[PDB]
Amino acid sequence: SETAWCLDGFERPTGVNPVIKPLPTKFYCPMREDSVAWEESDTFNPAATIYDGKIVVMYRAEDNSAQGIGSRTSRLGYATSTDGIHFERDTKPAFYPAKDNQAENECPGGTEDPRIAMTEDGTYVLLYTQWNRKVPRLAVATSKDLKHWTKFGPAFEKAYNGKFKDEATKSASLVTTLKGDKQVIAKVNGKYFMYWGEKNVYAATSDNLIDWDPLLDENGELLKLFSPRSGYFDSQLTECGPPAILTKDGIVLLYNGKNEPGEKGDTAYPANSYCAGQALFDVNNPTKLIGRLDKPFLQPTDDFEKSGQYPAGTVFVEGLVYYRNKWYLYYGCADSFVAVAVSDKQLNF
Ligand SMILES: [Mg+2]
């Protein structure tokens, strides 16, 4: 099969979704200095990882402090599961804006759209968006326990004398691999590597997981590994999803395509909807694109995927774990809920 390399075979378990919905839970916010209903409006765009024998989903939670996409405060919840479907949720968010070293970048919009991957020595590396209602910035935090976090600030703060420190950035997929059943961050040609971006798929390297250097073209502009394309589901945006997976057949990148309305999109899919795709890069040259799905492997199907805070619908893939011999894929549903799909497919390592 020409698509044998992809991680497909996903199925929504019958009747279980969504697995995380909003709740009226309160916590004392150090940014507001006030008790806030931190997950009252929408719970979506989740990171996922494995810690202490369980699946952990860290979901993007929004309060009702305003109406409109990007108008409120995002904080990350902490939910655990032993079956991938039923979650036990903390009442206090595990990650949030505060009067800390990142206050200016994260106030008042908070901390959005997390992805998590883990090093071989057990360090969780969180890539997320800082939102201060001016510029979204991709930033890095680390922890050993997913609760005691150190914030290191924007991923591109230092690179090339700060060239990109005030550019709008988000949505990063670190390269990982499986060593046996254990999913860990993997160097490519001696460097840590990630795919990142929303408007195109860009990349960056690092020696230390915190300071990242975006790949550039000959003019010193961001190198576009691939881009939105006329006539396909990913015709307006190509936005990186969960961490990438280095297999024997290439580096697999799950990503989110936004469909251009009308004839320059794929009219098989709803206008403006986000449906999930996959790309494949060469293991030795990780900027060399060697595969890309013509059609999405996941699309809005249930009513809470087809419309919500985002009216045109999303299945926004962002968390992915290998647990109890299966893949559990966590995705945002129309910027409003978290859902799971499960696959038995075994990739080649
Ligand atoms: Mg093999």
Give DSSP secondary structure letters for 91-142. Answer: SS-SB---SSTTHHHHTTTEEEEEEEEE-TTS-EEEEEEEE-SS-EEEEEEE
Amino acid letter, residue 305: E
* 198: nearest Cα among 172, 233, 216, 229: 172
For residue 248, how far is its CA from the centre of ligand 1 (angstroms)?
7
CA 20 to chain centre: 16
What is the C-alpha separation between 42 and 44, in angstroms, rounded? 6
349 C-alpha to ligand 1 centroid (Å): 4
- Cα angle 185, 11, 266 (rounded to 5 degrees) comes to 90
- How many residues are recorded in the chain? 349
Beta-carbon count within 10 A of 207 CB: 12
Architecture of domain 1-349: 5 Propeller (2.115)
DSSP secondary-structure letter at 13? P
216 to each of 25, 146, 286, how far by Cα in Å?
44, 33, 14
Report residue 53 as tokens.
Answer: 């024998």
Two tokens, residue 20:
């995380």
Cα 311 to Cα 319: distance, rounded to the nearest angstrom = 22
**Cα-only R_g, the chain:** 18
Query: Going by C-beta distance under 8 Å and a sequence separation of 6 or more, which residues neighbour residue 328?
Result: 48, 55, 84, 320, 321, 322, 340, 341, 342
Residue 79's nearest CA partner among 319, 317, 333, 307 is 319
The closest of 81, 106, 84 to 95, measured between CA atoms, is 106
The CA distance from 286 to 225, in Å, is 9
Alpha carbon distance 243, 209 (integer Å): 14
3-state secondary structure string across 257-311: EECCCHHHCCCCCCCCCEEEEEEEECCCCCCCEEEECCCCCECCCCHHHHCCCCC
Token pair, residue 14, equals 């019958």
For ligand 1, the distance from its centroid to the CA atom of residue 246, given in whole angstroms, is 12
Closest by alpha carbon to 316, among 18, 73, 9? Answer: 18
What phi and psi values does residue 250 have, to the nearest 5 degrees?
135, 180
Residue type, 244: A
Cβ proximity of 76 and 96 under 8 Å: yes
Q: What gap in Å lies between CA 83 and CA 313, rounded to an integer?
A: 27
Distance 217 CA to ligand 1 centre (A): 34
123: left (phi over 0), alpha (psi -120 to 50) or beta: beta
Would you say 7 and 245 are in contact if contact means Cβ atoms under 8 Å apart? yes
Q: What is the DSSP letter of 187?
A: -
154 CA from centroid of ligand 1 (Å):
37
Q: What is the rounded distance in angstroms from the CA atom of residue 241 to the CA atom of residue 122?
A: 22
Q: Say if residues 343 and 243 touch (Cβ distance below 8 Å).
A: no
Distance 320 CA to ligand 1 centre (A): 20
4 Cα: distance to centroid of ligand 1 (angstroms): 13
Return the bridge partners of 48, or none. 57
Q: Closest Cα partner for 333 from 44, 72, 79, 78?
A: 44
348 is in an annotated binding site: yes
How far apart CA 50 and CA 43 sit, in angstroms, is 20
**Beta bridge pairs of residue 332:** 316, 338
Answer yes or no: are the C-beta atoms of 271 and 259 closer than 8 Å: yes
* Adjacency order of strands within the sheet including 315-323: 315-323, 326-333, 337-343
Residue 214 neighbours by CB distance under 10 Å: 23
CA dist list (Å): 92 to 2, 109, 329, 344: 46, 18, 24, 33
- Which CA distances in Å does 266 have to 70, 208, 332? 27, 41, 22
What is the Cα–Cα distance from 53 to 182, expressed in whole angstroms? 12
242 Cα–ligand 1 center, Å: 22
Angle at 156 between CA 290 and CA 321, to 5 degrees: 55
Is 95 marked within a binding site? Answer: no
Alpha-carbon span 136 to 164, nearest angstrom = 12
In angstroms, rounded to a whole number, what is the distance separating the alpha carbons of residues 276 and 308?
17
